[PDB]
Structure 1
Amino acid sequence: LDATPKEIVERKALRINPAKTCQPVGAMYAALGIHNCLPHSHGSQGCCSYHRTVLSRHFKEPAMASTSSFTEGASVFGGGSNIKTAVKNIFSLYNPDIIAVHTTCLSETLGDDLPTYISQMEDAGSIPEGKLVIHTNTPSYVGSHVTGFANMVQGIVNYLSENTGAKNGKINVIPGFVGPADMREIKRLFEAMDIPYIMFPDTSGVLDGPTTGEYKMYPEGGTKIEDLKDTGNSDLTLSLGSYASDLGAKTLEKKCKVPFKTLRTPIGVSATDEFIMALSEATGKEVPASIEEERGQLIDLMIDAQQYLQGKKVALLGDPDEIIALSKFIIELGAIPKYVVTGTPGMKFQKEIDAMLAEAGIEGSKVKVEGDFFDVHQWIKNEGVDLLISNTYGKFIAREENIPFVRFGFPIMDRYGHYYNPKVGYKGAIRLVEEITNVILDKIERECTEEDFEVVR
């Protein structure tokens, strides 16, 4: 699985094997986090097929979205006419309570003003009694899917957040670009500390779920319009991801004036503790015996497995929020983050990683923001690493250089059941320690000599 020059070359313009994808699919993900939402791609129709096909492949599930299917002509006459028609065949045929719209390269390059287009459909009675249209602007040539997520969170606060003068004693949570299982786990934790919330997006009963025998275009998870409106009357917002929940955070607080705190995505001991600590300093809730047990069973696993988790150098690629907090966990475990890469941009990834290594006296590690898989493979060829944690395309390096691989991130389009596991919390972290220990011990028991092979490890 080869032909990478071992000899490192630095490339200026040829992007090979990217460790990111384009904004619209993050924006499609987040919009599927609203109940009775049907995402709309406003640009050519190629972009819709591609993004719904990746969402189905990673969750073995349906992504449903519609297009202003742009032709030759919209390059001359905009996409006004296109979303107008699109909205009439949507509401007529398959009616969402909300159409959440986002754009592609085309609409951003052509200068499409879907603020006036919406007001036109609206004035023109093309939006029925009581229904609605929301939009965000997801330009493909800046940022990545984390940024499309982060922008759709803002467009929905911007259209829907209200301070109607009456505070709920709820805390708003924006879970970041995490999967249904992590939203579901954090809801599990709120409620364990007995704190009412409003969590948006909420892919929970949308991108996992039951084969019951009836199909619904609008599954029943996601946030209800009414609750998305009530976010303006909360006491606090908690952003779980400075790259993904923060535009929202700010935009809710500049608009409804509901103040926000930014935490790290809750992966591993350090960042999961500061998550329960944020829930205490805020409501004043005493932390139960249960979560206490959960913390300690991570500590007995971390400690019992310790021989295998010590001095293991790891290559990690992914999205900024999840890889920053997972690199903290890898340090906490005993291991060394040797190659830390994100395709998605931003200084903060790189200088947060820099002072966790520097902090821990780890040296020789390479931190690359805006790097791909061709970079990390060339690295492995001049300096072999001990574990690989990556989304599904990590497997090509892991079979060439026989490396223990742990699939993590978006996109994993490979194994079945993975979307039912948390990676957040102490439960998620237990499951991580467990698969990291097993892929390692798997390789050992395969590699070793007959005579030199054990029964208790």
Structure 2
Amino acid sequence: PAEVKLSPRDREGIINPMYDCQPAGAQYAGIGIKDCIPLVHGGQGCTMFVRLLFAQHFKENFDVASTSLHEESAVFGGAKRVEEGVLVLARRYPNLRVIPIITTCSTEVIGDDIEGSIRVCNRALEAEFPDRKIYLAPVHTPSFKGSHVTGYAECVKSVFKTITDAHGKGQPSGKLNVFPGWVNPGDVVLLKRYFKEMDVEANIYMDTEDFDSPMLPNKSIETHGRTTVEDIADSANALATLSLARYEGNTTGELLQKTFAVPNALVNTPYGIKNTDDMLRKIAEVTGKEIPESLVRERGIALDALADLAHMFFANKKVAIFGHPDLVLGLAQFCMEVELEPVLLLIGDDQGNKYKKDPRIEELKNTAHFDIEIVHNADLWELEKRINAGLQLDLIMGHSKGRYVAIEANIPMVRVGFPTFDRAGLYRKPSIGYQGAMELGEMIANAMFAHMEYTRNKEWILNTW
């Protein structure tokens, strides 16, 4: 009677949304580009609340501007607000090179002609700044479909289309393109090390390592995306694209394959051991480079650590996971590797028709020995209501906006995905790869250990494990 079931939320309304709207994800894509300030065409909250969200996750400022739609534009249209906003950015930020122009619910409803405004601004900018090139990318992100996951993917794709349309195909680079998806600076640091150890040249899109910026003696601000116009333009010239996230950048890898014949390889997001193994095998396949001994060792260190935990503390423990779909599906596989039982997976948006075709669902259906409920179009009330109805969980894995569910239910909780504002430093700690699997497993154990102490549940057992 062994069943992995997909079902939608049974309510029309949302209580406690899992994700933000599309424009928020588009902003996140854009802030990873060097010399980029996204321009969010709509009311002011659509910008300011997202700048706050990024400050909650990263404890850093990121620059995003608004077009400040007001009442007159709601009656007569807002094109003049886009056009002014572009010029005001260009005039006041002399080094600015890229402006994704991100629509919102308001500006999608009223039908402002973004591409027409871009033609006006391109003419104005070419006349006023003859020796400057600014790339204006139209990003259509109505908030009444999809989520910040879809908006991220749409913005990446539009920026890549815009910049590669301008520069076309040149000389082969010998590099990989890599789209890790929506990951932390620590995940980017880990991937750079993997490619360096395997002697593989690669651009990671976007390179967000420097979001964790120093406080320096010279008072310099280094909190920038490192992916440049040049880096994005060179994507046309790659040997191949490695796409780690079906819902977070694969569509850009496909676009580069259609436009420039750069072959795209979509792999399972590298959460856990097998998914990391298979990612490295694909890298080896496409580059002809061997997997280095250093990665065999990191893998073995991870396995050694996880083996201290799995049958002692994890076996038969019931887990709920929520977050981005690539993360939820990848973490469910990781959980199984360490004998955890992910019985409830919650995915937070209207993309169920795609999720039903995800091959990882089938990988779960063919492996799990316990029922799995996958709730799509889920909110976080879907988790709280199921706990209130009697679902027994030993662990929750998810982002910080679910914290009160775990706190009130007295269930230990590991913070994963976005945003993780209610713990310190998690943006620096990998979750993907071998090291990431080890770090995740040790977070899980340490959360369980503290819970055993606070609840006096065999707390004496933490001596000779």
Compute the TM-score of the two structures, normalised by the length of structure 2. Answer: 0.92
Counterpart-to-counterpart distance in 1, 2:426 and 2:159: 29
1:228 is displaced (CA, Å) by: 0.9
Contact 1:64/1:217, CA 8 A, preserved across alignment: no
1:357 is displaced (CA, Å) by: 3.4
Query: Do structure 1's residue 232 and structure 2's residue 232 form an aligned pair?
Result: no
Counterpart position of 1:131: 133
Quick one: structure 1 residues 58 and 90, their matched pair in 2 at CA, closer, same or farther if it must change by over 3 Å? same
Contact 1:265/1:321, CA 8 A, preserved across alignment: yes
Contact 1:80/1:114, CA 8 A, preserved across alignment: yes
Query: Do structure 1's residue 442 and structure 2's residue 450 form an aligned pair?
Result: yes
Counterpart-to-counterpart distance in 1, 2:226 and 2:97: 12
1:399 is displaced (CA, Å) by: 1.8
1:376 is displaced (CA, Å) by: 1.0
**One-letter amino acid matched to 1:416:** A
Counterpart-to-counterpart distance in 2, 1:335 and 1:59: 29
Counterpart-to-counterpart distance in 1, 2:271 and 2:285: 20
Counterpart position of 1:383: 391
Counterpart-to-counterpart distance in 2, 1:364 and 1:450: 28
User: Secondary structure at the residue paired with 2:452?
Assistant: helix
Identify which range, 48-57 or 440-449, moves more after superposition.
Answer: 440-449
Counterpart-to-counterpart distance in 2, 1:237 and 1:194: 16
Counterpart position of 1:6: none
User: Secondary structure at the residue paired with 1:244?
Assistant: coil
**One-letter amino acid matched to 2:414:** V
Identify which range, 428-437 or 84-93, moves more after superposition.
Answer: 84-93
Counterpart position of 2:104: 104
Contact 1:236/1:261, CA 8 A, preserved across alignment: yes
**One-letter amino acid matched to 1:172:** N
Contact 1:32/1:222, CA 8 A, preserved across alignment: no
Counterpart position of 1:119: 119
Counterpart position of 2:281: 277
Query: Do structure 1's residue 371 and structure 2's residue 374 form an aligned pair?
Result: no
Counterpart position of 2:369: 362
Query: Do structure 1's residue 403 and structure 2's residue 408 form an aligned pair?
Result: no
Contact 1:388/1:394, CA 8 A, preserved across alignment: no
Compute the TM-score of the two structures, normalised by the length of structure 1. Answer: 0.93
Quick one: structure 1 residues 451 and 267, their matched pair in 2 at CA, closer, same or farther if it must change by over 3 Å? closer
Identify which range, 302-311 or 213-222, moves more after superposition.
Answer: 213-222
**Alignment partner of 1:343 out of 348, 354, 359:** 348
User: Secondary structure at the residue paired with 2:216?
Assistant: coil
Percent identity, aligned pairs only?
A: 34
**Alignment partner of 2:176 out of 141, 151, 171:** 171
Query: Do structure 1's residue 418 and structure 2's residue 426 form an aligned pair?
Result: yes
1:451 is displaced (CA, Å) by: 9.5
Query: Do structure 1's residue 433 and structure 2's residue 433 form an aligned pair?
Result: no
1:225 is displaced (CA, Å) by: 0.7
1:98 is displaced (CA, Å) by: 1.7
Quick one: structure 1 residues 376 and 449, their matched pair in 2 at CA, closer, same or farther if it must change by over 3 Å? closer
1:447 is displaced (CA, Å) by: 2.6
1:383 is displaced (CA, Å) by: 1.7
Residues 80-120 of structure 1: per-residue CA shift (max 9 Å, x gap): 21111112211111231222221110111111221111111
Contact 1:174/1:239, CA 8 A, preserved across alignment: yes
1:49 is displaced (CA, Å) by: 0.5
1:163 is displaced (CA, Å) by: 4.0
**One-letter amino acid matched to 2:305:** L
1:62 is displaced (CA, Å) by: 0.4
**One-letter amino acid matched to 2:108:** E
Contact 2:178/2:205, CA 8 A, preserved across alignment: yes
Contact 2:303/2:438, CA 8 A, preserved across alignment: no
Contact 1:390/1:406, CA 8 A, preserved across alignment: yes
**One-letter amino acid matched to 1:432:** L
Q: How many residues align?
A: 448
Contact 1:350/1:369, CA 8 A, preserved across alignment: no
User: Secondary structure at the residue paired with 1:74?
Assistant: helix
Counterpart position of 1:326: 331
1:356 is displaced (CA, Å) by: 3.6
1:316 is displaced (CA, Å) by: 0.7
Residues 290-328 of structure 1: per-residue CA shift (max 9 Å, x gap): 111011111112222121121111011111011111110
1:218 is displaced (CA, Å) by: 7.0
Question: Structure 1: where are the runs of 5+ without partners?
Answer: 1-9
Counterpart-to-counterpart distance in 2, 1:299 and 1:451: 25
Counterpart-to-counterpart distance in 2, 1:345 and 1:215: 45
Written as runs of structure 1 = structure 2, the 5 A alignment for 1:207-218 is: 207-212=211-216
Contact 1:27/1:102, CA 8 A, preserved across alignment: yes
Contact 1:338/1:365, CA 8 A, preserved across alignment: yes
Counterpart position of 1:81: 80
**Alignment partner of 1:293 out of 270, 290, 297:** 297
User: Secondary structure at the residue paired with 2:206?
Assistant: coil
**One-letter amino acid matched to 2:133:** K
Counterpart-to-counterpart distance in 1, 2:418 and 2:39: 21
Query: Do structure 1's residue 257 and structure 2's residue 261 form an aligned pair?
Result: yes
Residues 31-68 of structure 1: per-residue CA shift (max 9 Å, x gap): 11111101110111111111101001111000211111
Counterpart-to-counterpart distance in 1, 2:183 and 2:283: 19
**One-letter amino acid matched to 1:277:** R
1:191 is displaced (CA, Å) by: 1.3
Counterpart position of 1:5: none
User: Secondary structure at the residue paired with 1:412?
Assistant: coil
Query: Do structure 1's residue 188 and structure 2's residue 193 form an aligned pair?
Result: yes
1:181 is displaced (CA, Å) by: 1.8
Contact 1:390/1:408, CA 8 A, preserved across alignment: yes
Contact 1:99/1:134, CA 8 A, preserved across alignment: yes
1:19 is displaced (CA, Å) by: 1.2
Contact 2:39/2:86, CA 8 A, preserved across alignment: no
Contact 2:41/2:104, CA 8 A, preserved across alignment: yes
Counterpart-to-counterpart distance in 1, 2:90 and 2:329: 42
**One-letter amino acid matched to 1:42:** H
1:455 is displaced (CA, Å) by: 2.8
1:409 is displaced (CA, Å) by: 1.1
Counterpart-to-counterpart distance in 2, 1:46 and 1:152: 19
1:135 is displaced (CA, Å) by: 2.5
Quick one: structure 1 residues 220 and 60, their matched pair in 2 at CA, closer, same or farther if it must change by over 3 Å? closer
